[PDB]
Amino acid sequence: PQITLWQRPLVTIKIGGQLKEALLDTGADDTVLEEMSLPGRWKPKMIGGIGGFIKVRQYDQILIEICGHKAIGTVLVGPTPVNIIGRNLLTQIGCTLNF
Amino acid sequence: PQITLWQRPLVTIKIGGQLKEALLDTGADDTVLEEMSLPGRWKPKMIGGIGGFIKVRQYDQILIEICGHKAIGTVLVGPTPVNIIGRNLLTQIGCTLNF
Numbered sequence: 410p411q412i413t414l415w416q417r418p419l420v421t422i423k424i425g426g427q428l429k430e431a432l433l434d435t436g437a438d439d440t441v442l443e444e445m446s447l448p449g450r451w452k453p454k455m456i457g458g459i460g461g462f463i464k465v466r467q468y469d470q471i472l473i474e475i476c477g478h479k480a481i482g483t484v485l486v487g488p489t490p491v492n493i494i495g496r497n498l499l500t501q502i503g504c505t506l507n508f
Numbered sequence: 509p510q511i512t513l514w515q516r517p518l519v520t521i522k523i524g525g526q527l528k529e530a531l532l533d534t535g536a537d538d539t540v541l542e543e544m545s546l547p548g549r550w551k552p553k554m555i556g557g558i559g560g561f562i563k564v565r566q567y568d569q570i571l572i573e574i575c576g577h578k579a580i581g582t583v584l585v586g587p588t589p590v591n592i593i594g595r596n597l598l599t600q601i602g603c604t605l606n607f
């Protein structure tokens with residue numbers, strides 16, 4: 410699709426067999442989701458942004474589907490205000506910025 | 509122009525007749541710039557991000573030029589690591605997300 414930015418660019422993703430909403434975020438390097446249980450082993454990590462650092466669980470090679478497009482990559486889970494899709498998966502689905 | 513997302517989407521902006529670099533960010537509602545001393549009146553404000561909140565000063569009606577395109581609006585100034593161009597100015601330059 411072509412998404413304009415008059416509203417937050419929130420879409421539906423599918424992950425773990427669950428449906429969620431997430432923000433398409435060109436200003437994020439990584440993908441951060443709210444607390445959930447995913448199958449798999451995970452490692453503790455830290456990530457930062459405005460306000461500071463949070464602790465997250467890192468899951469690799471996770472299948473996610475973003476507007477019907479498949480991506481397979483690293484997902485961090487932790488206490489984010491919002492589900493964020495970052496550049497690690499935006500590139501996999503062929504996302505660009507245009508103006 | 510079309511910007512790919514392999515790297516962070518950093519572009520040149522002109523503000524106050526000075527050039528800076530800034531991140532095009534579809535996940536920011538607001539525009540946040542590094543500390544600098546603009547003339548003008550300001551309001552104090554708090555904005556949040558992944559790790560919590562920071563204090564900023566709010567300036568309205570600022571002209572920024574982004575890759576040749578002008579935009580005019582509210583800019584928040586404070587102790588950010590990176591200059592962030594948010595949706596309030598992105599919409600004005602006709603910027604879209606495409607995949």
Ligand SMILES: CC(C)[C@H](NC(=O)N(C)Cc1ccccn1)C(=O)N[C@@H](Cc1ccccc1)[C@H](O)[C@H](O)[C@H](Cc1ccccc1)NC(=O)[C@@H](NC(=O)N(C)Cc1ccccn1)C(C)C
Pocket residue numbers: 417432434435436437438439440441456457458459490491493516533534535536537538540555556557558588589590592
């Ligand atoms: C999500 C996280 C993994 C990401 N971090 C990240 O990419 N890092 C640390 C790598 C890095 C280092 C140096 C330079 C560039 N990038 C991040 O926070 N990115 C920030 C940019 C940044 C980078 C480093 C330090 C400081 C800032 C980027 O601005 C994101 O788009 C971020 C995403 C987000 C959105 C909502 C709530 C939490 C996080 N937006 C924001 O932090 C903005 N907030 C915002 O727009 N809010 C709170 C309103 C809102 C609410 C709900 C939904 C959308 N918007 C502020 C910049 C204004």
